[PDB]
Each structure stands twice: as C-alpha cells, then as structure tokens.
Write a protein that binds this ligand. Structure first.
Ligand SMILES: CO[C@@]1(NC(=O)[C@@H](C)C(=O)O)C(=O)N2C(C(=O)O)=C(C)CO[C@@H]21
Ligand SMILES: CO[C@@]1(NC(=O)[C@@H](C)C(=O)O)C(=O)N2C(C(=O)O)=C(C)CO[C@@H]21
Ligand SMILES: CO[C@@]1(NC(=O)[C@@H](C)C(=O)O)C(=O)N2C(C(=O)O)=C(C)CO[C@@H]21
Ligand SMILES: CO[C@@]1(NC(=O)[C@@H](C)C(=O)O)C(=O)N2C(C(=O)O)=C(C)CO[C@@H]21
Ligand SMILES: [Zn+2]
Ligand SMILES: [Zn+2]
Ligand SMILES: [Zn+2]
Ligand SMILES: [Zn+2]
Ligand SMILES: [Zn+2]
Ligand SMILES: [Zn+2]
Ligand SMILES: [Zn+2]
Ligand SMILES: [Zn+2]
Lengths: 264, 264, 264, 264
C-alpha cells in the first residue's frame, strides 16, 4: 500500500469566474472574480492592489489593470487582508511582473514568507508560492500612495496577521469612507485550548469590537458574500450590503454558537 | 468559463511505496521508498540524512530512523542533491520535528527558500513547503559529522544547485568510497538558448566530466533506476549497479540526442 | 567635507565583563556577563539558552556551557526576550557552532531576520549579524524541552516582539516559579504619536498589567540592575531582587513621568 | 579585563567625498563619490542603479538622482557587482525609499540576505543592513529596462557572486559598449587551501579570462582607481583608463605574486 498522493487546493467555480472591472468609488475598482475580491485603487502617482485571490488569477488581474489604463510598472504597492492562498495567491508572481512592493504586518509577512505552509489550522494542505514583504507595518499605521491614505487595523482571528484597511475615497466629489475588513470566520478551527493558538478566543472577541468601530460608509470583504456583496449584478452589487456593526454582530453570533457546539 | 483549477504533483506509485531500511555500508542506510533514495548515515555523534523524497514521506523517514535507533533529536544535518519536491519535499517538516540543520549551496538554498516555485523549467507547477538553509557550502567543501567527512561536488545541470556528495565508509572494516551523484536528466528542458539558463549546455557538459572523476567505489542516485539500483530485491540491489563512468557516459549520450532532436 | 564615518555600538565595560556560571536554581544558570543576563537551563535531553548578550560574547557563552558539561551539540533551543544587539547579538554565530534552533514570535523573528536594522526608534545605528527563526510561537504557547515547560507571554513595548518567559524549576527539590521578563524601558522613544508605532502607549500599559500577573517566585531581567540583581556578589545576588509587581509598578511610574515630560 | 568593544568599518575619506553627477555616456552617469562608483542609467521607462557604495551614501544617491530629474519612484532596478558594505551598503534603505527591485545571482543574494555577515574572509567585521533580492539571475542572462539590455557575466573571485555587467549605450548617437567589471583583488585572502573556498584559485583564473573577453569599449570598476578612472578631474576622467585586457592582465600578475608570496 503506497503513500497517498498529494491533493490540490480546489475551490468553487465562482471563485475562479473572471469579471470585468466593477467600479466601487471614483478611484476604487473590483478587478477579481465573482466570489473573490481584488481591489484596485488608481492614484495620480500609481496604483494600489488589495488582495489578489487564487494563485492562478495573476494573469486576470493584469488584464483588468490594463483595462483601467494601468501598466504593470504602475502598480506601486500590494496590500493584504490575510496570507492565505485564496487571497494572497498571485502575490509572488505579481511582484515579479509588476515591480511592486508588498506591505504587511509581521504575522502576515512570516506566513507569506513560507507560502501558507505550516498553517496553524490547515497544516500544509493549502500552500501557494511564497513571497517576501518589503515593508512591515504596525497597528494603526498609515500608508500613503498618491495622496490616498491607507490605515491598517489589526483584527487577529482568521489568521494572526488579519488586517482591515480603511481609506477615504470620493463618489462624484462626495467623500466616502471605505473599509475593507478581513473575514471573521473559523472554518473547522479548534477554538478552545488550541496549542498552536492559545489566546485565539481573546483575539476573535477583541477583533469583533475592532470591526464595529471602523470608520466605514461602505464595507467590503475578501469574500463578497460575507458582507452581502453580489459582484455579478453589476450596478446593484452594493444594494443589500451589510454595515460594520451588522457584519461583526453576525460573525460573533456564529463564533459563539460554534464555540458552544465545540464544548459538546 | 471559469479559470482552471490547481493541479497537484502526482507521481508513480512506486515512488511512494515505503520500504524498510536496506543497508548500503556499515554506516549507510537507504530508508526512503522503492523508487526514491533517502540515505541515512549513523555516526557516533549523530545521524545525517541525504535527501528526503516526496513531501508526504516525512513520517516514513522518522519511522525508519526509529528502527535504526535514531531519535529525532539525533538527526544533526540534512544534505540535499537538488531542491525539487520529489527529493527535498519533507525538509521543512523534518527541520521542525528533528532539530536538524540544512547545509546546501547558494543555488539550492534560494530554490529551497521559495519551495521550488518559479522553477527555471517547471514554473510553479511543482511546489513544496519552503525551508531555509542554515549553512551555505562551496564547491569542494568538506562537512564533517561524527568523524565522517562529506565532500560536496557541484554538478550544475538538472538544477543550478545540483550537488554530488562523496564520503568514505567501511564494509566489514574495508573502506568503501560512496558517491551520491545527482540526476543528469533534462525532462522537457529547453537546452538551446534558454533565457532563464543561458549557459545550460556548458554546465551539463562540465558536470558530465565531474561525475566521471568522482572518487567512487559505489554509486547511488536520487532515483535508484538511474544507476540500475533495485531497492526491492534487498540483498541483490547493488548487483547490476553502474559505475561513475557508465552513469555519466550514458547520461551524456541521452543529452546529445535530445539536444540534436531539439534543433529539429 | 566628506560624509561621516560609521560609528560602532559601544557599551559600558561591565556589560562585557565575563563571569563564571552563577547558579539560580537546580537547572538554571547565569552564564553571561556582570551586566548582561544569559540564562542556561540544563535538562535531561539538552540545554536551553535564553538571550545571549552582545555580539562578541559568543565565545564566552560556549566556554561557560563547557564548564557546565554542555557540549555545543547539546544546546537544543535558543529563546529571546527581544531582538536587540545587546541581547540577541551572538544568536547567528551560536546557531552555526551549536546546531541549535531559535524560537521567537513573528515580531521578534522579522527584527532578528534583518539584524536589528530599520529599528522603529534606533534606525540602523544598532545592527548585529542577522539570524533566522526556526519556530514561530504565539502568545501563551508552551515550549517543552527535556520535561521543562517554557511559557511565552507577549509584553509589547520595548520592541513589538518583547516576550517574557516563565518556567517552574526546583531548588533542593522545592518548586520555584522563575519569570524572565523583558525590559519595560523606552530610552529616547517618542511615545506620543509615533508614526512607526501608533499604538505604543496602549501596548506599554497592557504590558505593565501582564508583568504584574506573571506566575513568579523569582524574577530576572535582561539587564540585572532593572530587577536589583547583582551578579557580582555571587551568593547574595538575588538578595534585594524585586517582585513582578515592584518591577512593573516602578517601570510604569517612569513611563508616565517620561510621557508627561514628552508633552512639554 | 572586559571583552573588546565593537569596531566600526572606517574607510578613506575620499570614499565618502560626494561628487556631482559626472556623465559617462548619453544615458550613463556616475553619481557616487570620488573613490566609489555608483552608476545611474536613465531610460524612457525608468532608471537603473548599479552599486551604491557605503551604507551612509543613501541620501547622497537620492540627491544626485533628483539632479538628473529622477524621482525616487522612477528607480526601477538595483544591480550589484558584489554584496560588500562598500558597494551594497545603502541597498536596504534605497529599496525602502524608492520602490525599486534588486536583481542579483544566488551567491550575491544570500550574502546580501545576511548583510555581509559570516563573510568567507572577513567574518562579521564588515556588516551592513541586510536586503533581499527580488529576482535571481543566471550567468549570461539579459535584464532589459526601457530598451537598454544589461547582460550579466559571472566572475567569481572577490566574492562568490561577483558579477560584471555589460551594456551598449550611445555617445552623441555613436554606440559605445560599456563594461562594468567587478574587482579582481584579494586583500588578505588565504588563496591556497582555504576551507571556506576550496576552488578559489580556479575561480580567480577563470574570471581573468572572462574579463578579457568582455565586449567593452569603455571599462568601469567599483573602485575607480582600479581601472585608472579619476572622477575628480571631471572631463578628463576616462583619459588614462585601462582596457579589459590591461585590467585583467594587471590583476592576474598581482594574484600570482601574492599566491607565490603566500607559499613562503
Ligand atoms: C484557506 O481558504 C479558506 N478555506 C478553504 O478554502 C478550505 C480549507 C475550507 O475549509 O473551506 C479560508 O480560510 N477561507 C475563508 C475565509 O473566510 O477566509 C472561507 C469562508 C473558506 O474558504 C477560504
Ligand atoms: C520535478 O521532479 C521531476 N520531474 C517530474 O516529476 C515531472 C515534472 C516530469 O517531467 O516527469 C524531476 O526533475 N525528476 C527527475 C530527476 O531526474 O530528477 C526525473 C527523472 C523525473 O521526475 C522528477
Ligand atoms: C539597543 O540597546 C539598548 N540601547 C542602547 O544601548 C542605546 C541605544 C541607549 O539608548 O542607551 C536598549 O534598548 N537597551 C536597554 C533595555 O532596557 O533593553 C537599556 C536599558 C539601554 O541599553 C540597551
Ligand atoms: C570589504 O571592503 C573591502 N575591504 C576593506 O575595506 C578592508 C577589509 C580591507 O581589507 O582593506 C573590499 O573587499 N574592497 C576592495 C575591492 O577591491 O573590492 C578593496 C580594494 C579594499 O576595500 C574594499
Ligand atoms: Zn483564509
Ligand atoms: Zn478565504
Ligand atoms: Zn528533480
Ligand atoms: Zn527527480
Ligand atoms: Zn533593547
Ligand atoms: Zn537592552
Ligand atoms: Zn569588496
Ligand atoms: Zn571594494
């Protein structure tokens, strides 16, 4: 009886369904797929990319950046929510083909440095090509590119380096405060007494309060369904979107019920 | 039409067929599978592991080390031939569970650091968990562990960091010079005018002469069939084994014919 | 007028005054200098080193380990308080000459990876040879070596990766709870509105409460004077030592006065 | 008697004497100091920097790039000769403040990754802030930026990753072939039987032949005096400059005499 074969990381087909650039604000564009968020922010001095999706999406992101008139050498910075393969997949290839830098916190940098291997909950099952972080950022730090200020807010939980990014854009000249909050889920995580993450419950709870207090007029999440975004219906995508309170309060109820069912 | 799914790195079943420790010399043991070489060298001050095989072989290697009376903390050093997933797969997990160090040259270290991603010929198709090299070694350098001296011989070709290791063991008190030479194949490689490896032909040719001149009374290769080793027949495994000249001369004939067919 | 010359990191002479192993508990030994703490813990399966001091102390640490009958290959693990040159200096050389692994959190790992360069407060003025962390640890995680359990407690402040280590030893068979807390000082730090560390005050305050609640019957600090340890007087070294409450309460009073004087 | 203090890396004052941009060709500019070469190549799609000099020269390089009308975000690539502190010093700071990428071979990347520590000949005496290489290049590989092609030529000797860069510029429309060859010196190196570099003599000899055959109409070196460049006299700087043959033949005579005196 031979040893088992390696198994690839397969996802839903909608996660890999490419879409054209859907506009969020005057400078913010969704250029990922129907079920994976990849945000582009075009400024006067360059573009900024927030997350990238699956590893095989690198070419699709570049095609959509070309549609927005953004050349590869115009991408200045890559920001991340958390360093899992379904969000930070193409980061390594994007750095090679765009000449961009990656800014992330220490926890996301070390997870990105080993390509998602030795995950606290997933082990080596979800692995992507590794990449290095060029700039380490702290909680509440401000990253400015082309006059647009990106503020990081640590929200540990899904990964130890989970980060929410908030910035202020315009919509026909009216200022809108966009908050890109990371996921607050724990799919199959051992919450109680996890040796690889002893203070996991304290971090999740403290992150729920963090998401509630985010300066936010419009919320987006790495998975659009988590905040009731529907990238497929085009104009009416943000119709039934959730608030920061509604998103954090719904996520905490799921966390407590899962925590209660774990004690069984 | 969605983007294609990720595909895993599947191999022949014999590459994953575990085997018990087959003895090579007084201190050298094969503890891998039937078609993947993993050499253990037990010394008075600790053990040395040469290659590890597929990524899912980490547990099998530890079980065989236990059969030889080698505890995890007794593995002192990990040496490599080249940093591909079918040879350096479990290196990252082995470092975590054994407290061992990895010695490799600059070219193998950087390929091991990115887990085989961005391969010169394979791209991101064959990816394994990344690991870091603790000690960088040069061509002709001597690594000593427990009185046994391991000499490295650079043989660039299959990978830029392909390394042959030679050491002198005993067999019932009689000194035997064991040479562990890396593969000299180029499966699907573009040999002529490869932009990622311009001087590839010069390196292959120079490596053929290197393998011929290795101090060698017994030759082993990462794939046992490359030197006509048959780990399955136990005692008669080294019966029809090849010499250093026979192995290099057969590999060069295949390289030239492939090079001639490439010009077509 | 030429550009200014590089200036080395010079310290007090007592920081570099070697001392013989002074015993703390049945298994805990101070093997550093008179004004720099380097703790050795000898277990049945190997030794553990906590901090190392200045970069030029690597040879002195090895000599003292030899006096305790600890061979270089017997050092299994290196633990750190924070990755500054006066505490993590010889870590890179120690890893080369002992075959030991380093366990630290993400923030200490990335600072250790760049050798103290690009410090949040010191820039590139205090730089030491870089080293890599082999195992990343989380807050409250337990590291066990030879039956002795080391519990990490994150106390961000002096550096973002400042860590206190607590373990339970014996003293003539009587269990003693030793806590090795990191420094709580801010020599020349901008506390209010520091762009490289926006939430610095929140981390310092939260760390003061962390140090107070440490399970501790005997406290040691990277600088022995910070807890009124006097390694020079031998037996009477722990005579006037401070408690966890006394150490945290004295450090907070200095932090608030410095914070009040900063607002001037 | 306390342990000795750390000593900084002090150099000649002329190595730190800033100079204004002296023009080499239509697109090539020397923007370093009087005795340290730092070459800037302005193209239509961005600038390229070859070497940077001492670590404290980062601000001077940026000032000279501003004089050439090159903004920090316009520096696309950093190329190196070898990763010593007097040539790759400011690379880490330049990457932070310019958003540029670094391309170097495996041997230079690993030396740059540890900031010059654990040098084969210098140990930890010459240490600079570490930086990471974004793109690994092979011997004879071509790097193109803005239509200007940079060809790498490995010349191991001074360091294992010593690289000569050759490109073709214009001078009033007339094509000039510029070769930037690395140093061929061995100041205090043990040449014969060096355990850290066993095949050092073979690499030096093979590199002498490499420098002779470089396509070169104008030669520059990291230290301008090595090729009889005098950056101080402005226009007449390249007056008494050496050829590729003259530079390699003079360096080999010094190597053989030093090798003969070493055998004494
Ligand atoms: C590693 O990627 C994830 N997990 C998986 O794909 C497998 C392992 C699974 O358990 O379903 C992960 O985390 N995601 C999230 C998230 O909320 O971030 C959700 C909702 C589920 O999908 C991705
Ligand atoms: C990356 O692993 C290898 N390649 C593959 O598995 C695929 C990609 C394939 O082309 O067959 C690779 O190289 N090997 C060698 C070797 O000689 O080293 C041989 C003989 C073929 O198998 C492994
Ligand atoms: C980087 O090393 C330190 N700082 C210096 O040496 C210079 C920069 C200085 O400002 O005096 C640092 O932090 N230490 C601590 C500590 O409490 O950790 C104390 C008390 C002061 O000494 C070391
Ligand atoms: C590490 O920097 C160097 N060495 C020193 O500065 C000290 C250590 C010294 O031995 O003089 C080094 O190599 N250089 C070269 C070169 O040719 O590259 C020359 C000519 C001498 O200066 C620099
Ligand atoms: Zn995820
Ligand atoms: Zn996800
Ligand atoms: Zn291979
Ligand atoms: Zn193979
Ligand atoms: Zn400090
Ligand atoms: Zn200190
Ligand atoms: Zn040099
Ligand atoms: Zn030099």
């Amino acid at each position: 009886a031979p040893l088992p074969q390696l198994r690839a990381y397969t996802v839903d087909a909608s996660w890999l369904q490419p879409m054209a650039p859907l506009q969020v604000a005057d400078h913010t564009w969704q250029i990922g797929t129907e079920d994976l968020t990849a945000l582009l922010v075009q400024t006067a001095e360059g573009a900024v990319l927030l997350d990238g999706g699956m590893p095989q999406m690198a070419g699709h992101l570049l095609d959509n950046m070309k549609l927005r008139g953004v050349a590869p050498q115009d991408l200045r910075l890559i920001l991340l929510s958390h360093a899992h393969a379904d969000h930070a997949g193409p980061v390594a290839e994007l750095k090679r083909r765009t000449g961009a830098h990656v800014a992330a916190n220490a926890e996301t940098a070390v997870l990105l440095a080993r390509g998602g291997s030795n995950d606290l909950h997933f082990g080596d099952g979800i692995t992507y090509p590794p990449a290095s972080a060029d700039r380490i950022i702290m909680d509440g730090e401000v990253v400015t590119v082309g006059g647009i200020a990106f503020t990081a807010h640590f929200m540990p939980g899904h990964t130890p380096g989970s980060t929410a990014w908030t910035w202020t854009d315009t919509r026909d000249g009216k200022p809108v405060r966009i908050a890109y909050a990371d996921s607050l889920s724990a799919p199959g995580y051992q919450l109680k007494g996890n040796p690889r993450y002893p203070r996991l419950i304290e971090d999740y709870k403290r992150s729920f309060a963090t998401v509630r207090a985010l300066p936010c007029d419009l919320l987006l999440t790495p998975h659009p369904g988590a905040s009731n975004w529907n990238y497929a219906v085009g104009s009416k995508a943000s119709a039934e979107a959730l608030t920061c309170n509604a998103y954090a309060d719904a996520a905490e109820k799921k966390f407590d019920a899962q925590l209660a069912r774990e004690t069984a």
